[PDB]
């Protein structure tokens, strides 16, 4: 399983990520937390993103 | 695990939220209730939103 | 479970609803019936709507 | 399950239906066959439609 | 029960098909292979199409 | 199944692929890794792509 270690790295390293949604919208922030269905992306406020609506998670720099 | 405590906080605190749909539409209101598949968003009327159609849930202020 | 009591109320009360689809289209009618996957929306004819394509169900008045 | 008796009627009665897709596209023809995942819509040729891509099935007249 | 015989025919007969995606995009080629999640569509190269992203499979002539 | 051998080939051969997303976006890079839900596409950085958001995987040359 790749998803947990990948999201976990981005979390620990408080890396600025771009979460791209299935509709094309680009969300940005740091990954605050995550579970099986959602990812909490912190920014001005924490927003709960559903994984099912995420197409791709792009770190802003190598990890 | 994240989703339930997160939606639960927004509920108790009767916090104005913006639910963004996969189609880009922004719904607004307070979270009245929720289960495994839907979230009741109260406004002028209660509307049943399917989670599968939700991309992101954004509280209008920190919690 | 919120979905079943919610759709059930709209049914019994023969309330005019607007079913919004993931593509943005707004369907209208009364909820004739429903099961795990589809909702029968009566109008001129009964049309079978797949829940997976529904974003939000909006009653035309409080219930 | 409402889906099977509903599609079955449309089949037996060889009723002209409009299948609306999640992308907004309107397909037309008669329902030739169907199973748990797909519907064969006959027209000039039989096309296999995935139910997951169908938003709504609209008969061209009451049944 | 319909999907396998249908794709199997298109395969054996090496029939030019149009695979329409949920996003509207039209793919073309012959069905090289398929299992239960994805379809190999041969063209200039073989491309793996996810069935979940396919709305409709349209043969270019009757079968 | 064919997904695993197909992605595995593209991996071993470090073949430039185009992953097309359900939103129309074309991702490019080499397949670094993959599991049941996601594909790590290496580029400038590794990005985690959800398979559910992938429509088609197109190698840049035959394999």
Curated annotation (Swiss-Prot), chains A, B, C, D, E, F:
Q: Which GO terms describe its molecular function?
A: ATP binding; bent DNA binding; DNA binding; RNA binding; RNA folding chaperone; tRNA binding
Domain of life assignment: Bacteria
Q: Tell me what happens on changing residue 20 to D.
A: Almost completely disrupts the ability of Hfq to form condensates in both growing and late stationary phases
The signal peptide, as residue positions, is none
Q: How does it assemble?
A: Homohexamer. Interacts with H-NS.
**Entry's family note:** Belongs to the Hfq family.
Per the entry, what this protein does is:
RNA chaperone that binds small regulatory RNA (sRNAs) and mRNAs to facilitate mRNA translational regulation in response to envelope stress, environmental stress and changes in metabolite concentrations. Involved in the regulation of stress responses mediated by the sigma factors RpoS, sigma-E and sigma-32. Binds with high specificity to tRNAs. Binds sRNA antitoxin RalA. In vitro, stimulates synthesis of long tails by poly(A) polymerase I. Required for RNA phage Qbeta replication.
**Name assigned to this protein:** RNA-binding protein Hfq
Q: Covered residues of the complete protein?
A: 6 to 68 of 102
């Amino acid at each position: 399983s790749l998803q947990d270690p990948f999201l976990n790295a981005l979390r620990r390293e408080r890396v600025p990520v771009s979460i791209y949604l299935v509709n094309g919208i680009k969300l940005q922030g740091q990954i605050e937390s995550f579970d099986q269905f959602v990812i909490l992306l912190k920014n001005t406020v924490s927003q709960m993103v559903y994984k099912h609506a995420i197409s791709t998670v792009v770190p802003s720099r190598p990890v």
